[PDB]
Amino acid sequence: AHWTINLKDADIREFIDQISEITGETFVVDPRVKGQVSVVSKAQLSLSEVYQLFLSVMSTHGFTVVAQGDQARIVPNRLETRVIQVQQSPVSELIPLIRPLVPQYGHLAAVPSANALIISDRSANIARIEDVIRQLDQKGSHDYSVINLRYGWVMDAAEVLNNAMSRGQAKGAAGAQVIADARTNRLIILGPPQARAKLVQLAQSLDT
Amino acid sequence: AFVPAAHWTINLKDADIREFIDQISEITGETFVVDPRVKGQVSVVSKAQLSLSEVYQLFLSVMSTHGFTVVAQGDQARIVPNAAPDRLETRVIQVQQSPVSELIPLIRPLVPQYGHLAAVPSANALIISDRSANIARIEDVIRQLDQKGSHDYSVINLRYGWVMDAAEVLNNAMSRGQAKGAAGAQVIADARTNRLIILGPPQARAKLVQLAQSLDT
Ligand SMILES: [Mg+2]
Structure with a gap:
């Protein structure tokens, strides 16, 4: 069977x-x-x-x-x-x-x-x-945000965002997750609502 | 046939x-x-x-x-x-x-x-x-x-609400002027998975995401 x-x-x-x-x-x-x-x-x-x-x-x-x-x-x-x-x-x-x-x-x-x-x-x-x-x-569904980067590079952006969250420099974003999509140079940002909304703002600040 | 326009x-x-x-x-x-x-x-x-x-x-x-x-x-x-219509x-x-x-x-x-x-x-x-x-x-x-200048978007998987109702309420509120702060944002209904795709400039999109969450309470 x-x-x-x-x-x-x-x-x-x-x-x-x-x-x-x-x-x-x-x-x-x-x-x-x-x-x-x-x-x-x-x-x-x-x-x-x-x-x-x-x-x-x-x-x-x-x-x-x-x-x-x-x-x-x-x-x-x-x-x-x-x-x-x-x-x-x-x-x-x-x-x-x-x-x-x-x-x-x-x-x-x-x-x-x-x-x-x-x-x-x-x-x-x-x-x-x-x-x-x-x-x-x-168990819950994954709400997420997509950011199409214009200036930055997603593998770099993903590493900076992960490093900041692991080192405690991304206050408010703890718990959020980032998936780099290198084919279209975009980030996929997941997590609980408050953490996710903060990581979107940090990601957006990085692509200026 | 294929027509030259090599x-x-x-x-x-x-x-x-x-x-x-x-x-x-x-x-x-x-x-x-x-x-x-x-x-x-x-x-x-x-x-x-x-x-x-x-x-x-x-x-x-x-x-x-x-x-x-x-x-x-x-x-x-x-x-x-x-390993469909006619x-x-x-x-x-x-x-x-x-x-x-x-x-x-x-x-x-x-x-x-x-x-x-x-x-x-x-x-x-x-x-x-x-x-x-x-x-x-x-x-x-x-x-x-x-x-549109940007195609960045947020996705909301509706747990309680019916997708088509949420989209209609959000569109009506934006067209009537009732969604303060979200003007300029746009909604795409994705019925197959009962979720909303929200587009627009960053701050307006961030506000329409908050408004969408109040309809799935
Ligand atoms: Mg054989």
Whole structure:
């Protein structure tokens, strides 16, 4: 009924065979399919959720799965694919907030039935995104503010704002959180109302 | 057909998707094998002139709109079904003053789940897929949003209130002069998630955010 997985530096063809053994689905794999994969889920996944993870891994490495009666065809169109369990926030709400941190070479997908996220990126950027998810995770909804920077640079702005909050220089902002969205040079500011409203003012003061 | 404008324009209405694929092959020189299951009627429109690479982006948006994708199968490119109303138009909307990426989160609440929305940053254009009457309505929203100097925004997830009521009260109060301090700010309802998107200059936006919180008490 449920499965976990810990596959490290395995041929993508082994991962396909392991999905066939788990799900019972048989695949006809195009000769051009190739690559090394690392796939991890410490969370228990249902048969349907294992299939969603399979699609995310295929998409991560540039492969499409096409219906073909009974069997399905795998065809072309180091990264680890990890399943991250979210405890309190709805996963579909966190997706847009985490997408900025995922590079264009990566993958990000929701698994709403397990309240989990699937991410593909280098192992070190996943661990950094895991900490962001852990800080975001909460029962209440995330109201937020977006600031499109005109003069400053978001990775610098995010570091200054984080440093000021950690050192006690951002009085009133304690508890607020900032997510840098480097693709569009914008900041996403979260947190409880008073703290969030103050961090928006500090961020705005920085882009003058 | 694609009409020279090397740039082109296009205004294809109610054509077989297979005709649209053949036209893309004639312009791009790319040869495709179309899986027997690929079917449908398409309307594709660009009054803006598109380069060769932008015509290819429009092609991908049309394929994705109708549930198709391009794969490599047996030494050739194959268009296949990937894992909605009968009449969908795919229109390119050029944006004049604002960077297109900044308008995308403000117009996404208006694109339904069957639709499509993609950026074409090299032409500063948006590709939208929807019913022709719905696209015209979104084109007016883009024209109004594009005249604004800032596209910074605040999001409020309403826990108690109904989204459409809150938006109407806030708009009425701003139009009647009752939202002191928030004049100049604007509201976009996002029903799918029962949330408000508040825009405007910083202080007015900060005041409309406070006013919006009083309606969800
Ligand atoms: Mg095999």
